Design a protein around this ligand. Structure first.
Ligand SMILES: [Mn+3]
Ligand SMILES: [Mn+3]
Lengths: 1024, 129, 129, 121, 129
């Protein structure tokens, strides 16, 4: 293929002239930023781009500019195209290893100044932190080299090419290559120089090239440790190295964005609290091993660090170069079948975090990454998986300092090889225990393809060698969803040679033939349990443990049943936790035309909005946080189920159990919320518990002092005693009032002092109910009892298909008889309505009796619903009344769960209490769907201006409710597409279907499903 | 008429003449709710109804003013989120509108832009496609 | 310093055209010479819907060498982001605070919101005009 | 007025020991940022604040932190009060040159490291 | 002054080993024990103007006995003269026109503690308008 350049279709051309990967250290004196405006032009394909060996700055000066770093699909007015979203499918034809012939090619150009002294004093390099997909590099019209690996770095020696005065850098960037085949992550396709570019000036005669730091405990009791520091010095003109380790700074250290990101400085004295000092001797190995007496451990719960300074020293005893970094005393092992850190079998409370920003894409400001991690810490997360590639190199000090268990992952995904296979065989489902046989079929294309070995090894080598020295990283991962083949085995051998100190993960390798860990994604409990049992021998020993590298798919309303996963995690030593997918929605900000308004509004794009030929729609929106990286109810729920302290209140006792891996409860203040006075809780070690006699209902565990990025008073855990359903002390007026009953041909009236009740007998509709200045009426379309909800993302693949199939949205009430009698026991009147509630097309439905017992200040509504007929649905979304609220309506207040929404399998984070609608910002989903329900509601007060409250309570069971404004939710593509009525309604529900995680994972669990059955429930409408 | 944004007698010249579509315009939200969304010097207005084409509206011999919105309770809403919304849109079809000025701190609306008390005579056509 | 006894420049804020013109004439001698010029350090108060008549100020600026332009008040609304209880909704929403929202004993209300740009420092129709 | 410190009611006490103003130039090699989290405590008035001649770091360590730079009326949960807007009117009584007696006083504290070579160089 | 900038290049604060410039135009040295000041005649330099902010970079070096650099200042010169001339504010002889705004320090979340990034945003917007 001579119409496609050789290097874009050669899997072995991983780079040309790239320097060997070394440990990353930012140094202000060495690093000089080349970020900013660059000359830029885009071409249809390589053959339209100029020859860079002949490109003048005088010519490039005339082009438009683009700012580095940024993606070229994310510019003002979509100047250079729009983002493309695909999940599994490749957006190109599969013709390995050829990219498409029409291959967007972007040429970047800028200049920089070089001194006379500069070229003499320094070795000059260019370092590119990330360029997608690949590029060739030119300096002063001379070819320097080539590079592949979008999320990896690259350094090139530039010394031969530089001149005094102006220097011209030209980068030719290509969108597609043979590399595209191994970069098929479920994310946006975005191109360009999206990470920092730097000019490096290293001391010329000698400099530090690489450093290796390891900490190995000498002993099984993890006290004394050996600190090993090996240095690679390049050049002859040096004497020796010095090394100073400083006194530790406890992991409880207070940070903020400013101090975490501070990059200074040359004259800045790193530290002076010396602990250990070592010097090398002239002509001796520039490495050493030191015994360290009982050092403070580095742990994710307590990220204690020892700062160090490494000095390269010349003959005259002057400092040639310094490295200022840190040591975290930590050892990871596979021990008795568990992932072990300092001897302890840890629990992952994790997420997958992609690089994403709603405006900049994968070009994420560090400021924003810090924001992410502070939020994670604020919500009890202790681990992150770098799905599915290494991040910006500066991010790893953030993990080190804040404390996260980190899975650093190779930039390698091959998923798309399956798509044609899936479609050709009409595959419906993949299961963690069996799906590997399906991937085995196509592994020969890439992961079992010898032509790709060099590329695969490069992804491994680049991954490990850049980030080796970060204590936060405990696991290397070979990539994601790339099938299984010989190349993976090769990667495993190499990584163990390069870095024996860590463990290797790869989920595509079911049996872990070349991994140290087992890993499932989105497994069913039964599937987890099968695996556990088949890998635990008769003695109870297992060789390797199980983690869930992805689980509890956080797409939209959900995920349900995080609780049940957690119970499983705590019960078996074999399970060591999981990482939920995903941290945040990948929404891109854009201008949307409103379906509600006809006008232009800000929205967040998912597949289809940028009009891709092929895309995967709303699967972009699968985070615990929204596109703006703010918490959803998903994150709120996750924080609760993973809380590292259990507080159980029953039988006049509070039981507190420490569920941390390492730290004590000493940092926590326990408050009795009923009294406000604190509770003396003994210092609890991991897994230790205590029972304290108490009359309390509600206990909170809170931070005593600012520590890390958390503030004093920040809630870590809490518990409540279960709250019995109490009938409010409402006094029903049973005194005898004269009442006019008018039973007309169609309408029935009941009028009394302060009361007006009108029912349409033909429809079963309440035309108007006005009691003491407060009015409601039925929100009626076909039926007075309704069943539909705007489908969640989880509802879509199955439950919605069923509910639509059975016409649940078209349920009709057909009145058979209406009975009107005078009041009995204090009653004004009794109106009884007999009907069948059934959808068009169908036999199935409910023989329904609605008995309205009318009192002067209260209306008792008894509902009896008998499920009858053949060919029934399995379940319903919902069941209850819809009422229009009067013009007077202003706000509401409830006793039950809050402050936020709650659903059967997503409710426990929402503690019991008295809540006011005025105190709550109701959550707006990036993709409109079922929202705003409140489950386990004891009572609900609806406030009407100038007329007090209407109290609503269900007899003998808590109920569900939603008060809103909104409709057209099913078909609104974005928040701004949601329509709004001129009045509010109450959705008053006996029961509601759970939420689950079926968009990717298990269906709503049995105990949370709203199964088809008879319904019988009684409500009181009490008017103040 | 004038667009893409709003325009008022003494605040209109930046809004050049052309054919404008409501779908292309993000209508401006004031931090303090107040009079907004008027379009002055309007030659004609087409209102599109789903499945039924357009209703064309024009004033005889003079350009007119219009606002199409959703909103009420604007006088007493303290912030954008306090603005109430009907379940349907309305057309405010105006012969004339008072200028805007800078009287909160500065001169009153200038004479030639004030909607002075006087007789009003105007003719509209409601043309249905 | 109205008479610039210890300044090199004359300066008005929010002046009427008549007031500008009185000043010009009283400081231009019979020969047409003036000793010092006039700027408008603050004019065209940009609070909310407005300012009107920026046009008429400009015509004046170009007509007389004695006038050397102005600086409109202000660049942006001083709104502080906070959680507001909605009068429309009964629910909590993000809003931008002006005087009173933080419950000051004494405050000056909505005069915080007097920019060409809103509190988020984005253009209003004022800036566009 | 001995309940109001002398320097808060002296119009002539513009500074004490401030260096003469010079032209501003930022130099990375000279400037070292002290921005970030500082120990911070707020007091009702000067007389409730500790004597800084006797304040240990061991004592200040125990306080909550605030991030520099920031206003203290713009913190998470309005911890140290809320902003006040006035246009013309003073938000205090006019008794020139006295400030109010109840005068919010914020004490900031942090540490920094210094080398043997640093003090010499 | 037609030089292209963005937020990143405007805010870049580097650096010690960074070679400020090498396109030398004029050089001057002081002599031992003589006044650390000087006056240079510059042939027809490019004018600094707000419409065209042309700048000459400069480097000022303090030098010890051993001829080493004790301290450097890297800044710029803008060739511009302001006068009160024939009753007008004059820059380079030209009676200029202010197309201005008042800008307070304000951010909707941080108040007067404005990130420089945000100030840059302000000024880009001003220029765009
Ligand atoms: Mn939309
Ligand atoms: Mn409000």
């Amino acid at each position: 293929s001579c119409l496609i350049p050789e290097n874009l279709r050669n899997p072995k051309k991983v780079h040309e002239n790239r320097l060997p990967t070394r440990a990353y250290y930012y140094d202000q004196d060495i690093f000089e930023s080349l970020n900013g405006p660059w000359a830029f032009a885009l071409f249809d394909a390589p053959l339209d781009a100029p020859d860079a060996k002949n490109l003048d700055w005088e010519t490039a000066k005339k082009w438009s500019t683009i700012s580095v770093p940024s993606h070229w699909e994310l510019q003002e007015d979509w100047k250079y195209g729009k983002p493309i979203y695909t999940n599994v499918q490749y957006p190109i034809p599969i013709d390995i290893p050829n990219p498409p012939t029409v291959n967007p090619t972007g040429v970047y150009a800028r200049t920089f100044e070089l001194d006379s002294k500069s070229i003499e004093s320094f070795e000059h390099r260019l370092r590119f932190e990330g360029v997608d997909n690949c590029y060739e590099l030119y300096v002063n019209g001379q070819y320097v080299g080539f590079n592949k690996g979008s999320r990896n770095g690259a350094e090139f020696d530039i010394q031969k090419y530089v001149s005094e005065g102006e220097n011209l850098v030209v980068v030719k960037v290509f969108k597609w290559s043979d590399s595209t085949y191994i970069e098929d992550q479920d994310q946006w396709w975005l191109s360009g120089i999206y990470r920092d570019v730097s000019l490096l000036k290293l001391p010329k005669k000698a400099h530090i090239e690489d450093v290796r730091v390891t900490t190995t405990f000498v002993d099984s009791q993890y006290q004394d440790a050996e600190l090993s520091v090996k240095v690679d010095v390049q050049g002859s003109s040096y004497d020796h190295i010095n090394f100073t380790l400083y006194e530790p700074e406890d992991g409880s250290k207070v940070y903020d964005a400013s101090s975490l990101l501070n990059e200074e400085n040359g004259n800045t004295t790193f530290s002076t609290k010396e602990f250990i000092s070592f010097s090398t001797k002239k002509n001796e190995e520039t490495a050493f091993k030191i015994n360290v007496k009982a050092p403070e451990h580095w742990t994710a719960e307590n990220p204690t660090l020892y700062k160090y300074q490494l000095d390269l020293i010349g003959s005259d005893g002057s400092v040639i170069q310094s490295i200022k970094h840190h040591v975290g005393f930590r050892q990871v092992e596979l021990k008795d079948g568990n992932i072990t850190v300092n001897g302890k079998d840890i629990l992952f409370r994790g997420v997958n975090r992609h690089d994403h920003h709603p405006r900049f894409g994968r070009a994420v400001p560090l400021d924003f990454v810090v924001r992410d991690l502070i939020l994670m810490k604020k919500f009890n997360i202790n681990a992150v998986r770098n799905s599915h590639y290494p991040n910006h190199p500066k991010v790893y000090d953030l993990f080190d300092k804040l404390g996260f268990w980190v899975i650093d992952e190779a930039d390698l995904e091959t998923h798309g090889v399956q798509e044609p296979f899936n479609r050709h065989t009409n595959l419906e489902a993949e299961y963690p225990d069996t799906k590997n046989k399906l991937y085995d079929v196509n592994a020969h294309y890439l992961s079992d393809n010898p032509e790709y070995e060099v590329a695969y090894l490069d992804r491994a080598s680049q991954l490990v060698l850049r980030d080796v020295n970060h204590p936060s990283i405990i696991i290397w991962s070979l990539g994601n969803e790339a099938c299984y083949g010989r190349n993976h085995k090769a990667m495993y051998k190499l990584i163990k040679q390069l870095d024996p100190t860590r463990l290797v993960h790869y989920e595509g390798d079911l049996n872990a033939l070349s991994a140290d860990i087992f890993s499932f994604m989105y497994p069913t409990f039964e599937i987890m349990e099968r695996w556990r049992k088949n890998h635990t021998d008769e003695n109870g020993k297992f060789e390797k443990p199980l983690i869930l590298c992805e689980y509890g798919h956080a797409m939209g309303n959900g995920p349900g049943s995080l609780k049940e996963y957690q119970e499983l995690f705590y019960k078996e030593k074999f399970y060591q936790g999981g990482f939920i997918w995903e941290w945040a929605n990948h929404g891109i900000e854009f201008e949307d035309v409103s379906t509600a308004d006809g006008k232009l509004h800000k929205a967040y794009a998912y597949g289809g909005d940028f009009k891709e030929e092929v895309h995967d729609g709303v699967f972009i929106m699968d985070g615990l946080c929204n596109s703006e990286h703010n918490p959803t109810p998903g994150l709120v729920e996750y924080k609760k189920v993973i809380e590292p302290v259990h507080i159980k209140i029953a039988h006049g006792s509070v039981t507190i159990t420490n569920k941390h891996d390492f730290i004590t409860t000493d940092h926590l203040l326990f408050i009795d919320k009923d009294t406000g006075k604190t509770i003396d809780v003994p210092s609890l070690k991991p897994e230790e518990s205590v029972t304290i006699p108490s009359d309390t209902t509600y206990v909170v565990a809170v931070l005593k002092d600012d520590a890390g990025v958390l503030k004093a008073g920040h809630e870590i855990a809490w518990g409540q005693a279960e709250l019995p359903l109490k009938v409010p002390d409402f006094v029903t007026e049973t005194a005898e009032k004269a009442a006019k009953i008018n039973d007309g041909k169609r309408y029935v009236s009941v009028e009394s002092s302060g009361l007006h009740f009108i029912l349409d007998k033909l429809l079963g509709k309440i035309e108007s109910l006005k009691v003491k200045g407060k009015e409601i009426s039925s929100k009626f379309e076909g039926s007075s009892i309704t069943f539909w909800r705007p489908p969640t993302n989880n509802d879509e693949p199955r439950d919605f298909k069923n509910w639509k199939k059975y016409n649940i949205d078209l349920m009709k009430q057909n009145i058979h008889g209406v009975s009107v009698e005078k009041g009995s026991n204090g009653s004004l009147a009794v109106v009884t309505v007999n009907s069948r509630i059934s959808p068009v097309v169908f036999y199935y439905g409910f023989e329904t009796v609605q008995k309205y017992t009318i009192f002067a200040n209260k209306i008792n509504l008894n509902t009896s619903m008998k499920l009858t007929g053949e060919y029934q649905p399995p379940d319903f979304p919902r069941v209850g009344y819809e009422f229009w609220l009067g013009d007077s309506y202003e706000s509401f207040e409830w006793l039950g769960r809050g402050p936020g929404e709650s659903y059967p399998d997503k409710k426990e984070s929402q503690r019991f209490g008295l809540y006011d609608s005025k105190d709550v910002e109701e959550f707006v989903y990036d993709y409109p769907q079922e929202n705003g329900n409140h489950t386990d509601t004891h009572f609900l007060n609806i406030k009407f201006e100038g007329a007090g409250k209407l109290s609503i309570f269900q007899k003998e069971k808590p109920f569900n409710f939603k008060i809103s404004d909104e409709y057209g939710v099913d078909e609104a593509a974005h928040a701004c597409d949601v329509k709004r009525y001129g009045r509010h309604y109450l959705r008053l529900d006996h029961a509601i279907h759970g939420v689950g995680s079926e968009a990717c994972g298990p269906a709503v669990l049995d105990q949370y499903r709203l199964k088809a059955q008879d319904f019988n429930f009684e409500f009181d409408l009490a008017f103040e």
